[PDB]
């Protein structure tokens, strides 16, 4: 045999079998294989990697090297010809609120992060990749096709750096390149608490013995907490407005400030931790700071699991929910809890749910000021519009009262993401998330569309007419065949997202299978699953059943009118109720009596 386990990075396996709490790293969840689902290990491979050279070079790397006898098309050409649209009229989801998109991003950030390799530390190819567009080592530029308007305004390419991989990064390894998942595979609120001990400690308030998370000491939201600032430079949140000079937030996850509504959701979760810790200190004044932090952390982890599996997944997977995620039957320590490489592209279905604008609404759910509605691209790495423009409440009202974009075969990804994406150290609102996703599919050695159809027990179309039948769309099938020449070569991100959505769902059959399998494993493979007997008491579980995003908003903002079903498209005032009528989380079952 060859390398049975290349785990030289993070070899520290020091497990307490008795602990009623998760580790921060995710180590020690599975007793027989304690690294399973831990952060900073390889993404799982459900199918073998597919590289040009068998090992590490992406398809599209070598101009002369075909995939199955055809050249792979430029990611940006696919983006332009298939993914782009002009007309935002009629593109909204009539039955999903903007919170539906935003929770997807939150769950995805809890589960997976494959950060770009660190070879740009005092290196030219940081700006040289950008400046000269020369492919090599970790520089894998997204080249513009001849007719691209960006060729006219932005030079020859968009910079792109290859993802980090296991058995460290600049030299070779044991057969095929395996990308890293930097966060815990468990649905465990690692995006609030961190997946590394250093960060996890930095986020905590170790001054008081109250188990609190650190809060901003420079700004308040009408007396409610902000995340602390990340005081490190250069800051993209300062870069986008050097007058306001408001830094990015420091959260459990590196990406928290990528856009204003993600920063908003991270703010609600932090507030909820501190709220729970204060309630628990009342019930149990004898609990020290560590106990308070762990108990509140464990409740917030359960909150995220319940909203996700009870409220979110059913309205993503539709008819496919029951097929892939049956009712819970307890912890199965034979299940692989690791996030798969392909899942990290499957869950980018959210890219097609992001609409072109964000609104701030007032207490009557009416436009907040004269520029209430803003273009999404102005809100990438934007914290100043929170600190200096009315705090999170107006944005939270927009998350409730405004709609997700609907996935449309003729209108896939808004130009706000497809032409105006901002990336840190890049200085322009000029990147293309769709092109980045296609390039990253290839970076990660993804098997093509038909390999995944076969994995999912679905038909593998070989001809234009077969692709038309699967996509229920003759013009989309023709564009994909003109670019890819065979459905075997269609990148998984675009192939999965091209399929028409399942009934009562928001993804097609291929994505429902890949997502459904992953979420089944996330639940069944987790020793700390909230509903696993022993994790919580039966009385605690009865209290936890009553959690809602609506109550989270009521408890952690000055919003007093909320819908009961926050993921549905809700209109004010008909679909909104007073917070008074909304079930609370009853923490009385956490009262701990020794005497």
Ligand X SMILES: *[C@@H]1O[C@H](CO)[C@@H](O)[C@H](O)[C@H]1NC(C)=O
Ligand Y SMILES: *[C@@H]1O[C@H](CO)[C@@H](O[C@@H]2O[C@H](CO)[C@@H](O)[C@H](O)[C@H]2NC(C)=O)[C@H](O)[C@H]1NC(C)=O
Feature table: binding site for heme b: 108, 258, 351
Task: Map the footprint of Ca ion across residues 106-125, applying CB under 5 A.
Answer: 110
Q: Is 214 in the site for ligand X (CB under 6 A)?
A: yes
**SS3 label, residue 290:** helix
x/- letters, 113..142, toward ligand HEM (CB under 6 A) = xx----------------------------
For ligand X, the closer CB: 99 or 203: 203
Among 202, 196, 214, residue whose Cα is nearest residue 277:
214
In the list 33, 241, 332, 460, the residue contacting ligand Y (rule: CB under 6 A) is 241
For Zn ion, the closer CB: 152 or 222: 222
Q: What is the 3-state secondary structure (H, E, C) of 78-94?
A: HHHHHHCCCCCCCCEEE
Residue 275 Cα distances to 226, 551, 559, angstroms? 13, 12, 16
Q: Is 332 in the site for ligand X (CB under 6 A)?
A: yes
In DSSP terms, 536 is beta-bridged to 533
Write the burial class of residue 224 (CB in 10 Å: 0-12 exposed, 13-18 middle, 19+ buried): middle
For ligand X, the closer CB: 447 or 525: 525
**H-type alpha helices, 337-462:** 343-346, 384-387, 393-401, 415-418, 433-443, 449-455
Q: Let me know if 565 is a catalytic residue.
A: no
188 touches, from Zn ion, Ca ion, ligand HEM, none (C-beta below 5 to 8 Å by class): Ca ion
For ligand HEM, the closer CB: 416 or 488: 416
Binding-site members are: 108, 110, 184, 186, 188, 190, 258, 351
In the list 31, 124, 310, 388, the residue contacting ligand Y (rule: CB under 6 A) is 388
For ligand HEM, the closer CB: 439 or 557: 439
Which residue numbers in the chain precede an interruption (C–N > 2.5 Å)? none
- Measured in residues, the chain has a length of 595
Q: Is 224 in the site for ligand X (CB under 6 A)?
A: no
Residues that bind ligand HEM (rule: CB under 6 A) add up to a total of 19
214 touches, from ligand Y, ligand HEM, ligand X, none (C-beta below 5 to 8 Å by class): ligand X
Shortest reach from residue 39's CB to Ca ion, in Å? 8
Q: Is 124 in the site for ligand Y (CB under 6 A)?
A: no
388 touches, from Zn ion, ligand Y, Ca ion, none (C-beta below 5 to 8 Å by class): ligand Y
Residue 153 CA to residue 163 CA, distance in Å, equals 27
Residue 81 Cα distances to 168, 435, 480, 481, 482, angstroms? 37, 11, 9, 12, 10
Residue 250 CA to residue 230 CA, distance in Å, equals 5
x/- letters, 156..195, toward ligand X (CB under 6 A) = ----------------------------------------
Find the distance separating the first CA and the last CA of the chain, reported in whole Å: 59
**SS3 label, residue 483:** helix
Q: Is 279 in the site for ligand HEM (CB under 6 A)?
A: no
Q: Is 422 in the site for ligand Y (CB under 6 A)?
A: no
Distance of CA 237 to the CA centre of its chain: 20
The stretch among 29-37, 213-221, 362-370, 467-475 that binds ligand X (CB under 6 A) is 213-221
436 touches, from ligand HEM, ligand X, ligand Y, none (C-beta below 5 to 8 Å by class): ligand HEM
Residue 257 CA to residue 9 CA, distance in Å, equals 28
Q: Is 481 in the site for ligand X (CB under 6 A)?
A: no
In the list 104, 194, 505, 525, the residue contacting ligand HEM (rule: CB under 6 A) is 104
Shortest reach from residue 451's CB to ligand HEM, in Å? 20
Q: Is 362 in the site for Zn ion (CB under 5 A)?
A: no
In the list 1, 122, 207, 243, the residue contacting ligand Y (rule: CB under 6 A) is 243
Among 159, 177, 168, residue whose Cα is nearest residue 57:
177
Q: Is 571 in the site for ligand X (CB under 6 A)?
A: no
For ligand X, the closer CB: 11 or 223: 223
The secondary structure of residue 320, as a DSSP letter, is G
Q: Is 384 in the site for ligand Y (CB under 6 A)?
A: yes
Neighbouring C-beta atoms of residue 307, cutoff 10 Å: 20
Q: Is 231 in the site for ligand X (CB under 6 A)?
A: no
Write the burial class of residue 92 (CB in 10 Å: 0-12 exposed, 13-18 middle, 19+ buried): middle
User: Which residues are within 8 A (CB) of 19 and not within 5 positions of it... i.e. 6 or more apart?
Assistant: 28
Residue 565 CA to residue 400 CA, distance in Å, equals 10
Residues that bind Ca ion (CB under 5 A): 110, 184, 188, 190
Residues that bind ligand Y (CB under 6 A): 241, 243-244, 384, 388
Residues that bind ligand HEM (CB under 6 A): 101, 104-105, 108, 112-114, 258-259, 344, 347-348, 350-351, 353-354, 433, 436, 440
Residues annotated as catalytic are 109
């Amino acid at each position: 045999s060859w390398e049975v386990g290349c785990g030289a990075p993070v070899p520290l396996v020091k497990c307490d079998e008795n602990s009623p709490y998760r580790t921060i790293t995710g180590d020690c969840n599975n007793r027989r294989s304690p690294a399973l689902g831990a952060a900073n290990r390889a993404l799982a491979r459900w199918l073998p990697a597919e590289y040009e050279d068998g090992l590490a070079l992406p398809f599209g790397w070598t101009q002369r090297k075909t995939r199955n006898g055809f050249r792979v098309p430029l990611a940006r050409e696919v983006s332009n010809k298939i993914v782009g649209y002009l007309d935002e009229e009629g593109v909204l989801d009539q039955n999903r609120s903007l919170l539906f998109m935003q929770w997807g991003q939150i769950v995805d950030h809890d589960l997976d992060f494959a950060p770009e390799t660190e070879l740009g530390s005092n290196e030219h190819s940081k700006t040289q990749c950008e400046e000269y567009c020369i492919q090599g080592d970790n520089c894998f530029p997204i080249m513009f096709p001849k007719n691209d308007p960006k060729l006219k305004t932005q030079g020859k390419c968009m910079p792109f750096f290859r993802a980090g991989f296991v058995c460290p990064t600049p030299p070779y390894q044991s057969l095929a390149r395996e990308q890293i998942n930097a966060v815990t595979s468990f649905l465990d609120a690692s995006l609030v608490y961190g997946s590394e001990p250093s960060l996890a400690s930095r986020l905590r308030n170790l001054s008081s013995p109250l188990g609190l998370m650190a809060v901003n000491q420079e700004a308040w939201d009408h007396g409610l907490a902000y995340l602390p600032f990340n005081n490190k430079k250069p800051s993209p949140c300062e870069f986008i407005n050097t007058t306001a000079r408001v830094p990015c937030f420091l959260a459990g996850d590196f990406r928290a400030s990528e856009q204003i509504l993600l920063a908003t959701a991270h703010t609600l979760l932090l507030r909820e931790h501190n709220r729970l810790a204060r309630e628990l200190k009342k019930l149990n004044p004898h609990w020290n700071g560590e106990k308070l932090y762990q108990e509140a952390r464990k409740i917030l982890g359960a909150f995220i699991q319940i909203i996700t599996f009870r409220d979110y997944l059913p309205i993503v997977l539709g008819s496919e929910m029951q097929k892939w995620i049956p009712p819970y039957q307890g912890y199965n320590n034979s299940v692989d809890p690791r996030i798969s490489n392909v899942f990290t592209f499957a869950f980018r279905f959210g890219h097609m749910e992001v609409p072109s604008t964000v609104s701030r609404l007032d207490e009557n759910y009416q436009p907040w000021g004269p520029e209430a509605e803003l273009p999404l691209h102005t809100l990438f790495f934007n914290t100043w519009r929170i600190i200096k423009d009315g705090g999170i409440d107006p944005l939270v009202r927009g998350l409730l009262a405004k709609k997700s974009k609907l996935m449309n075969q003729d209108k896939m990804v808004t130009s706000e993401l497809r032409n105006k994406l901002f990336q840190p150290t890049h200085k322009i609102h000029g990147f293309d998330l769709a092109a980045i996703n296609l390039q990253r599919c290839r970076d990660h050695g993804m098997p093509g569309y038909n390999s995944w159809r076969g994995f999912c027990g679905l038909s593998q179309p070989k001809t234009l007419k077969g692709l038309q039948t699967v996509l229920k769309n003759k013009i989309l099938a023709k564009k994909l065949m003109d670019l890819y020449k065979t459905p075997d070569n269609i990148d998984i991100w675009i192939g999965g997202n091209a399929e028409p959505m399942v009934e009562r769902g928001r993804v097609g059959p291929l994505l429902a299978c890949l997502l459904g399998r992953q979420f089944q494993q996330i639940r069944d493979g987790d020793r700390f699953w909230w509903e696993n007997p022993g994790v919580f008491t039966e009385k605690q579980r009865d209290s936890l059943q009553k959690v809602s995003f609506s109550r989270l908003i009521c408890d952690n903002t000055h919003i007093t009118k909320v819908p009961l079903h926050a993921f549905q498209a809700n209109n004010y005032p008909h679909d909104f109720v007073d917070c008074s009528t909304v079930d609370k989380l009853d923490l009385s079952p956490w009262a701990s009596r020794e005497n």
